[PDB]
Amino acid sequence: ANPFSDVTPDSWAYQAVSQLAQAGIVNGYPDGTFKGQNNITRYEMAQMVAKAMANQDRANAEQQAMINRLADEFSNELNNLGV
Amino acid sequence: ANPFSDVTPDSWAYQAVSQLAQAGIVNGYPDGTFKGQNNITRYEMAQMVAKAMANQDRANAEQQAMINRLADEFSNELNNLGV
Amino acid sequence: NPFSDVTPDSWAYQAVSQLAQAGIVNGYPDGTFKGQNNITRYEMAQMVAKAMANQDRANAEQQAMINRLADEFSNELNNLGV
């Protein structure tokens, strides 16, 4: 539940956002976010998910499915952000 | 407007925050932000505006007027941020 | 304003400095603690919130530092959902 606990590189959600960054759908994230094996806070993840949701129409159907699932997973932080 | 939708370089607000960065009033933003002509999210723009409203003592009369206009234009995200 | 500054003179800046050195605070921008630059209350609060998320790493006085930071940045932490 804690918004500044971590999401780890071995998790589905980390790998999802990292792959959406590979795709250019996630862009504009703080430099070094995907560097090495550093965790990402749920709050930072949610910002990346919110931006992907705004760039949603450019995703393939599989990526749209990833965004949909991420949006559920981070709904509490997304609501905090006004999304 | 979604808080993580994009503000484009043609918008008054984009150009104003870029000018405030050149002047030093907006500082401490992500590197990359004003290099070239890439979009900035409303949420990041709002963080830059909040910073300038904190730094508004540095501003000349015309810059203070710009900042006031910006705080209006991003009032929704500024309210989310607690500004 | 959550984006008003915290200076390097401040107890709070130095405490998060110390906790980052201790490894309790991580994942902050690279230029955060260098060049004697101020930190916004917003970025301070994010680091404090990681310190709370990791508070089981801290000893008694580091916990006391975390507790004091959590009070100091309570408004920003609330806005962040913490």
mmCIF file of N, CA and C in Angstrom, chain C:
data_model
loop_
_atom_site.group_PDB
_atom_site.id
_atom_site.type_symbol
_atom_site.label_atom_id
_atom_site.label_comp_id
_atom_site.label_asym_id
_atom_site.label_seq_id
_atom_site.Cartn_x
_atom_site.Cartn_y
_atom_site.Cartn_z
ATOM 1 N N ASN C 1 4.553 26.822 0.088
ATOM 2 C CA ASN C 1 4.726 26.148 -1.201
ATOM 3 C C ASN C 1 5.630 24.929 -0.990
ATOM 4 N N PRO C 2 5.126 23.754 -1.353
ATOM 5 C CA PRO C 2 5.967 22.545 -1.327
ATOM 6 C C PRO C 2 7.213 22.651 -2.182
ATOM 7 N N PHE C 3 7.295 23.635 -3.071
ATOM 8 C CA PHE C 3 8.441 23.776 -3.949
ATOM 9 C C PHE C 3 9.347 24.918 -3.510
ATOM 10 N N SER C 4 9.045 25.524 -2.362
ATOM 11 C CA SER C 4 10.005 26.339 -1.628
ATOM 12 C C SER C 4 11.182 25.479 -1.171
ATOM 13 N N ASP C 5 12.291 26.133 -0.838
ATOM 14 C CA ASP C 5 13.552 25.427 -0.723
ATOM 15 C C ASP C 5 13.915 25.070 0.719
ATOM 16 N N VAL C 6 14.753 24.041 0.826
ATOM 17 C CA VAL C 6 15.458 23.651 2.041
ATOM 18 C C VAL C 6 16.957 23.785 1.782
ATOM 19 N N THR C 7 17.659 24.513 2.660
ATOM 20 C CA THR C 7 19.051 24.839 2.392
ATOM 21 C C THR C 7 19.969 23.824 3.025
ATOM 22 N N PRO C 8 21.236 23.821 2.618
ATOM 23 C CA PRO C 8 22.182 22.852 3.183
ATOM 24 C C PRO C 8 22.512 23.121 4.638
ATOM 25 N N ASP C 9 22.163 24.297 5.150
ATOM 26 C CA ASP C 9 22.423 24.567 6.549
ATOM 27 C C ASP C 9 21.496 23.770 7.435
ATOM 28 N N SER C 10 20.396 23.279 6.869
ATOM 29 C CA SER C 10 19.225 22.892 7.641
ATOM 30 C C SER C 10 19.395 21.513 8.253
ATOM 31 N N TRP C 11 18.742 21.307 9.403
ATOM 32 C CA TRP C 11 18.861 19.988 10.006
ATOM 33 C C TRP C 11 18.328 18.928 9.056
ATOM 34 N N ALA C 12 17.235 19.250 8.365
ATOM 35 C CA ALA C 12 16.529 18.274 7.523
ATOM 36 C C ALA C 12 17.375 17.846 6.325
ATOM 37 N N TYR C 13 17.955 18.814 5.599
ATOM 38 C CA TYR C 13 18.886 18.487 4.522
ATOM 39 C C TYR C 13 19.982 17.536 5.000
ATOM 40 N N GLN C 14 20.593 17.856 6.147
ATOM 41 C CA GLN C 14 21.724 17.067 6.605
ATOM 42 C C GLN C 14 21.301 15.685 7.074
ATOM 43 N N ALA C 15 20.082 15.571 7.611
ATOM 44 C CA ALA C 15 19.574 14.288 8.098
ATOM 45 C C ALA C 15 19.328 13.336 6.948
ATOM 46 N N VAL C 16 18.700 13.830 5.892
ATOM 47 C CA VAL C 16 18.485 12.960 4.749
ATOM 48 C C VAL C 16 19.822 12.639 4.093
ATOM 49 N N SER C 17 20.717 13.634 4.009
ATOM 50 C CA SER C 17 22.108 13.355 3.657
ATOM 51 C C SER C 17 22.672 12.168 4.434
ATOM 52 N N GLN C 18 22.567 12.207 5.770
ATOM 53 C CA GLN C 18 23.147 11.157 6.601
ATOM 54 C C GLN C 18 22.486 9.819 6.350
ATOM 55 N N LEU C 19 21.146 9.808 6.237
ATOM 56 C CA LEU C 19 20.410 8.572 5.974
ATOM 57 C C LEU C 19 20.679 8.025 4.581
ATOM 58 N N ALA C 20 20.914 8.892 3.597
ATOM 59 C CA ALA C 20 21.311 8.382 2.292
ATOM 60 C C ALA C 20 22.675 7.713 2.369
ATOM 61 N N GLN C 21 23.625 8.352 3.054
ATOM 62 C CA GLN C 21 24.940 7.752 3.258
ATOM 63 C C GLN C 21 24.815 6.391 3.930
ATOM 64 N N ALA C 22 23.901 6.270 4.887
ATOM 65 C CA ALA C 22 23.587 5.021 5.565
ATOM 66 C C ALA C 22 22.833 4.039 4.689
ATOM 67 N N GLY C 23 22.459 4.421 3.473
ATOM 68 C CA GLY C 23 21.717 3.536 2.603
ATOM 69 C C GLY C 23 20.226 3.461 2.863
ATOM 70 N N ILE C 24 19.713 4.160 3.884
ATOM 71 C CA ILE C 24 18.276 4.148 4.146
ATOM 72 C C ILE C 24 17.514 4.967 3.100
ATOM 73 N N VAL C 25 18.125 6.014 2.550
ATOM 74 C CA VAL C 25 17.534 6.800 1.470
ATOM 75 C C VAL C 25 18.290 6.496 0.180
ATOM 76 N N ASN C 26 17.544 6.178 -0.881
ATOM 77 C CA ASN C 26 18.105 5.844 -2.187
ATOM 78 C C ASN C 26 17.158 6.327 -3.282
ATOM 79 N N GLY C 27 17.639 6.286 -4.519
ATOM 80 C CA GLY C 27 16.742 6.513 -5.627
ATOM 81 C C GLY C 27 16.391 7.952 -5.879
ATOM 82 N N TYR C 28 17.235 8.883 -5.438
ATOM 83 C CA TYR C 28 17.034 10.306 -5.662
ATOM 84 C C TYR C 28 17.853 10.778 -6.858
ATOM 85 N N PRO C 29 17.478 11.915 -7.471
ATOM 86 C CA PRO C 29 18.267 12.449 -8.598
ATOM 87 C C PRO C 29 19.753 12.604 -8.294
ATOM 88 N N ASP C 30 20.590 12.649 -9.330
ATOM 89 C CA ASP C 30 22.020 12.489 -9.081
ATOM 90 C C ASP C 30 22.643 13.757 -8.500
ATOM 91 N N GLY C 31 22.190 14.918 -8.951
ATOM 92 C CA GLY C 31 22.754 16.144 -8.437
ATOM 93 C C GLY C 31 22.187 16.599 -7.119
ATOM 94 N N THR C 32 21.371 15.759 -6.470
ATOM 95 C CA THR C 32 20.622 16.172 -5.285
ATOM 96 C C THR C 32 21.536 16.812 -4.253
ATOM 97 N N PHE C 33 22.552 16.072 -3.804
ATOM 98 C CA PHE C 33 23.365 16.473 -2.657
ATOM 99 C C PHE C 33 24.669 17.133 -3.062
ATOM 100 N N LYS C 34 24.806 17.547 -4.310
ATOM 101 C CA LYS C 34 26.096 18.082 -4.664
ATOM 102 C C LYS C 34 25.949 19.532 -5.103
ATOM 103 N N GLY C 35 27.037 20.282 -4.948
ATOM 104 C CA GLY C 35 27.048 21.675 -5.334
ATOM 105 C C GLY C 35 26.376 22.614 -4.367
ATOM 106 N N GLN C 36 26.049 22.145 -3.151
ATOM 107 C CA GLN C 36 25.461 22.999 -2.101
ATOM 108 C C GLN C 36 24.168 23.640 -2.571
ATOM 109 N N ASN C 37 23.473 22.972 -3.497
ATOM 110 C CA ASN C 37 22.184 23.431 -3.980
ATOM 111 C C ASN C 37 21.072 23.169 -2.953
ATOM 112 N N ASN C 38 20.071 24.038 -2.949
ATOM 113 C CA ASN C 38 18.877 23.749 -2.157
ATOM 114 C C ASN C 38 18.136 22.537 -2.720
ATOM 115 N N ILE C 39 17.242 21.976 -1.896
ATOM 116 C CA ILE C 39 16.329 20.894 -2.277
ATOM 117 C C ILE C 39 14.922 21.396 -2.020
ATOM 118 N N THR C 40 13.991 21.067 -2.912
ATOM 119 C CA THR C 40 12.643 21.526 -2.632
ATOM 120 C C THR C 40 12.031 20.690 -1.528
ATOM 121 N N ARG C 41 11.045 21.270 -0.866
ATOM 122 C CA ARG C 41 10.335 20.485 0.143
ATOM 123 C C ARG C 41 9.693 19.240 -0.482
ATOM 124 N N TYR C 42 9.284 19.330 -1.763
ATOM 125 C CA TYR C 42 8.688 18.213 -2.504
ATOM 126 C C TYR C 42 9.655 17.054 -2.673
ATOM 127 N N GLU C 43 10.872 17.333 -3.136
ATOM 128 C CA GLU C 43 11.860 16.260 -3.262
ATOM 129 C C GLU C 43 12.324 15.753 -1.893
ATOM 130 N N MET C 44 12.453 16.645 -0.904
ATOM 131 C CA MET C 44 12.759 16.205 0.455
ATOM 132 C C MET C 44 11.739 15.194 0.938
ATOM 133 N N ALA C 45 10.457 15.506 0.747
ATOM 134 C CA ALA C 45 9.408 14.635 1.258
ATOM 135 C C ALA C 45 9.449 13.270 0.572
ATOM 136 N N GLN C 46 9.727 13.236 -0.722
ATOM 137 C CA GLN C 46 9.844 11.921 -1.355
ATOM 138 C C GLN C 46 10.957 11.097 -0.731
ATOM 139 N N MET C 47 12.121 11.730 -0.439
ATOM 140 C CA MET C 47 13.196 10.995 0.195
ATOM 141 C C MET C 47 12.817 10.561 1.603
ATOM 142 N N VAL C 48 12.168 11.443 2.354
ATOM 143 C CA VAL C 48 11.685 11.078 3.692
ATOM 144 C C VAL C 48 10.727 9.891 3.619
ATOM 145 N N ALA C 49 9.844 9.875 2.614
ATOM 146 C CA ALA C 49 8.872 8.788 2.504
ATOM 147 C C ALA C 49 9.553 7.464 2.206
ATOM 148 N N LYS C 50 10.630 7.465 1.388
ATOM 149 C CA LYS C 50 11.450 6.245 1.290
ATOM 150 C C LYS C 50 12.091 5.893 2.604
ATOM 151 N N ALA C 51 12.595 6.886 3.334
ATOM 152 C CA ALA C 51 13.170 6.571 4.634
ATOM 153 C C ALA C 51 12.142 5.895 5.536
ATOM 154 N N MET C 52 10.887 6.387 5.547
ATOM 155 C CA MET C 52 9.863 5.689 6.324
ATOM 156 C C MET C 52 9.577 4.304 5.789
ATOM 157 N N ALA C 53 9.480 4.154 4.462
ATOM 158 C CA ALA C 53 9.268 2.826 3.889
ATOM 159 C C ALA C 53 10.381 1.848 4.283
ATOM 160 N N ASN C 54 11.587 2.351 4.587
ATOM 161 C CA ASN C 54 12.746 1.547 4.976
ATOM 162 C C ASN C 54 13.086 1.673 6.453
ATOM 163 N N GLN C 55 12.133 2.072 7.283
ATOM 164 C CA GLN C 55 12.509 2.448 8.638
ATOM 165 C C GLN C 55 12.990 1.257 9.457
ATOM 166 N N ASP C 56 12.630 0.028 9.076
ATOM 167 C CA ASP C 56 13.158 -1.139 9.774
ATOM 168 C C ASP C 56 14.654 -1.347 9.549
ATOM 169 N N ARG C 57 15.276 -0.588 8.645
ATOM 170 C CA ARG C 57 16.727 -0.592 8.511
ATOM 171 C C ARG C 57 17.418 0.236 9.586
ATOM 172 N N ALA C 58 16.720 1.198 10.177
ATOM 173 C CA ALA C 58 17.336 2.224 11.007
ATOM 174 C C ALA C 58 17.516 1.753 12.452
ATOM 175 N N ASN C 59 18.498 2.336 13.137
ATOM 176 C CA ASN C 59 18.690 2.074 14.551
ATOM 177 C C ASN C 59 17.890 3.110 15.337
ATOM 178 N N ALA C 60 18.089 3.168 16.656
ATOM 179 C CA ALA C 60 17.233 4.032 17.464
ATOM 180 C C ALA C 60 17.397 5.493 17.073
ATOM 181 N N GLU C 61 18.636 5.961 16.863
ATOM 182 C CA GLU C 61 18.687 7.398 16.614
ATOM 183 C C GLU C 61 18.307 7.710 15.179
ATOM 184 N N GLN C 62 18.586 6.793 14.246
ATOM 185 C CA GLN C 62 18.159 7.009 12.872
ATOM 186 C C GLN C 62 16.645 6.999 12.794
ATOM 187 N N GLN C 63 16.012 6.097 13.548
ATOM 188 C CA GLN C 63 14.564 6.156 13.654
ATOM 189 C C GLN C 63 14.134 7.507 14.168
ATOM 190 N N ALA C 64 14.871 8.053 15.157
ATOM 191 C CA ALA C 64 14.484 9.348 15.703
ATOM 192 C C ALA C 64 14.614 10.423 14.643
ATOM 193 N N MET C 65 15.624 10.298 13.780
ATOM 194 C CA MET C 65 15.750 11.213 12.649
ATOM 195 C C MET C 65 14.563 11.069 11.706
ATOM 196 N N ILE C 66 14.191 9.826 11.381
ATOM 197 C CA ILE C 66 13.053 9.599 10.480
ATOM 198 C C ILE C 66 11.779 10.196 11.067
ATOM 199 N N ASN C 67 11.548 9.959 12.366
ATOM 200 C CA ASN C 67 10.350 10.477 13.022
ATOM 201 C C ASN C 67 10.302 11.989 12.959
ATOM 202 N N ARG C 68 11.460 12.631 13.127
ATOM 203 C CA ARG C 68 11.467 14.085 13.110
ATOM 204 C C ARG C 68 11.222 14.590 11.698
ATOM 205 N N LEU C 69 11.802 13.903 10.708
ATOM 206 C CA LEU C 69 11.586 14.293 9.305
ATOM 207 C C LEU C 69 10.131 14.116 8.908
ATOM 208 N N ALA C 70 9.523 13.015 9.337
ATOM 209 C CA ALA C 70 8.129 12.767 9.011
ATOM 210 C C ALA C 70 7.228 13.867 9.553
ATOM 211 N N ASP C 71 7.548 14.397 10.738
ATOM 212 C CA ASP C 71 6.747 15.501 11.262
ATOM 213 C C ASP C 71 6.964 16.760 10.437
ATOM 214 N N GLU C 72 8.249 17.076 10.158
ATOM 215 C CA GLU C 72 8.646 18.310 9.483
ATOM 216 C C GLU C 72 8.008 18.396 8.123
ATOM 217 N N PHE C 73 7.958 17.271 7.418
ATOM 218 C CA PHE C 73 7.406 17.278 6.077
ATOM 219 C C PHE C 73 5.992 16.705 6.027
ATOM 220 N N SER C 74 5.260 16.748 7.149
ATOM 221 C CA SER C 74 3.955 16.101 7.197
ATOM 222 C C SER C 74 2.985 16.600 6.122
ATOM 223 N N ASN C 75 2.952 17.905 5.847
ATOM 224 C CA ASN C 75 1.991 18.378 4.855
ATOM 225 C C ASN C 75 2.298 17.811 3.468
ATOM 226 N N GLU C 76 3.571 17.845 3.079
ATOM 227 C CA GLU C 76 3.965 17.324 1.768
ATOM 228 C C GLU C 76 3.756 15.823 1.706
ATOM 229 N N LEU C 77 4.078 15.126 2.795
ATOM 230 C CA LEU C 77 3.885 13.682 2.826
ATOM 231 C C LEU C 77 2.412 13.350 2.694
ATOM 232 N N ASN C 78 1.543 14.140 3.329
ATOM 233 C CA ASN C 78 0.113 13.906 3.174
ATOM 234 C C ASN C 78 -0.319 14.074 1.718
ATOM 235 N N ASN C 79 0.183 15.125 1.066
ATOM 236 C CA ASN C 79 -0.161 15.385 -0.328
ATOM 237 C C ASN C 79 0.317 14.272 -1.228
ATOM 238 N N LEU C 80 1.398 13.612 -0.854
ATOM 239 C CA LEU C 80 1.926 12.472 -1.592
ATOM 240 C C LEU C 80 1.212 11.170 -1.260
ATOM 241 N N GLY C 81 0.179 11.207 -0.412
ATOM 242 C CA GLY C 81 -0.526 9.992 -0.071
ATOM 243 C C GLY C 81 0.105 9.155 1.019
ATOM 244 N N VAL C 82 1.116 9.665 1.701
ATOM 245 C CA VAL C 82 1.832 8.891 2.724
ATOM 246 C C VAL C 82 1.158 9.013 4.099
#
